[PDB]
Protein: Baculoviral IAP repeat-containing protein 6
Organism: Homo sapiens
Amino acid sequence: DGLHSLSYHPALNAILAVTSRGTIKVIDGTSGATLQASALSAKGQVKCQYISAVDKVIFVDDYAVGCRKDLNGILLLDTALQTPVSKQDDVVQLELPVTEAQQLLSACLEKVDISSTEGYDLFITQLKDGLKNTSKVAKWATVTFHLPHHVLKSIASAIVNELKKINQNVAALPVASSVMDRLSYLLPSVDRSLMYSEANRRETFTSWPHVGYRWAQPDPMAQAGFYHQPASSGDDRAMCFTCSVCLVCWEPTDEPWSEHERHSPNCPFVKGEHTQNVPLSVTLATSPAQFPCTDGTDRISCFGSGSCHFLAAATKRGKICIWDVSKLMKVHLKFEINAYDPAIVQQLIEVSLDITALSILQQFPCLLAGGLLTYRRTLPVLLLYSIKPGTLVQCLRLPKFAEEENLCIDSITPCADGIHLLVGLRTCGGYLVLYKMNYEPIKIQHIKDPQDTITSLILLPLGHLVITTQGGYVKILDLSNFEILAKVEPPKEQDTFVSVIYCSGTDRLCACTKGGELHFLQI
């Protein structure tokens, strides 16, 4: 069919290719064998770029920005672009690994009698057929529940309750806890029973007085199973969700697991038993997509990330969202872009503004968007907004030729080395202008050939660059003087290369053609 894009996961050895059909194909980065072919449950072009600074796979559809981390060495893709529902009657989608699917199916068929629960027949039917169909591809296989939120929640709660009643520690208890927590997140609409998930325990620590401790920090404390339930001012009261242990008056040398084990070796969580715990690793690996707009009505045009703890996106209506994507993907700031700004009204020398490229800069942090102003003439410019909010720090008019050459920005990437910013301009056959980061350009280059119009950028570590041109020729290159290292040519009529990526783990570059083939180029 066609791939149309590419990204690479270094923590894994998986190449995440988009497909012209809107699905995502994960193929092996060492042998090129297909590991999985999963549709993200999206609603338009599908984005899949893995971000290295944040260490997460950021998917984007026209409407929502999914952000899935890896778990147990794979990614759960079947619902990366599923957004939270509002009514319990709404059918949620929820994928489980084949192994966890077997855990749940067995514990339902051999361990408990949660049958007669609302919509139990649909649940068992889906699990059975999912496991039958799938009967290294196995490590990535999954089974997806498509069930009314209440059916899935009731069945998960029933399984948890019965597995807690029989008290026989079976693998299905954590799987049902994971299903329950995922549902809790899919319907956003101290309680000791809500601490079975690592995220809840972490959020409990908001008043932890020992932020200076090397090992007793809230993140490790929640990881070890503790949650903070202060009883008085400055009270460092940490209780385990399942153990019933309670600890106080911590010391700098304390380490969560150490104190937990010495103070209660019998805890099922400390022993590594199959408890109800839902680690942050499963929350991050299945968190639901999030709309940038307060309604999600618009289309998404930009999903630029920063070298920094931050992701950003822009919608066609001028609303821009910025997520503290460190772990929790909590929306950090949403603001509005208005072309009639004090900076823009001057730098223009009726009007509308459309953002087309985004980026955030780090070694005070700033959001650097690329915009096209449309009076009626047009002009591509840079826009430096604040984050730490919505105040347009600097509108930067690009050199004069962009006024009449009918160009719009198409990419903005931080320099491979840093302290430098490469901007690219295409027509609404292009320009590459390099700015020195400002803690007019410091360099410029013009491309004239219509078969050398850029169609991608990898910006290998002024570092290096690897693009793909309209002619289908990737031009692995160095930015110091713009020297072509190897303008590889498309294979066979010709099958034009459409994108490239670099495998930090295997050192072999990958190229993907429009036709959908994959070629390994050595460097």
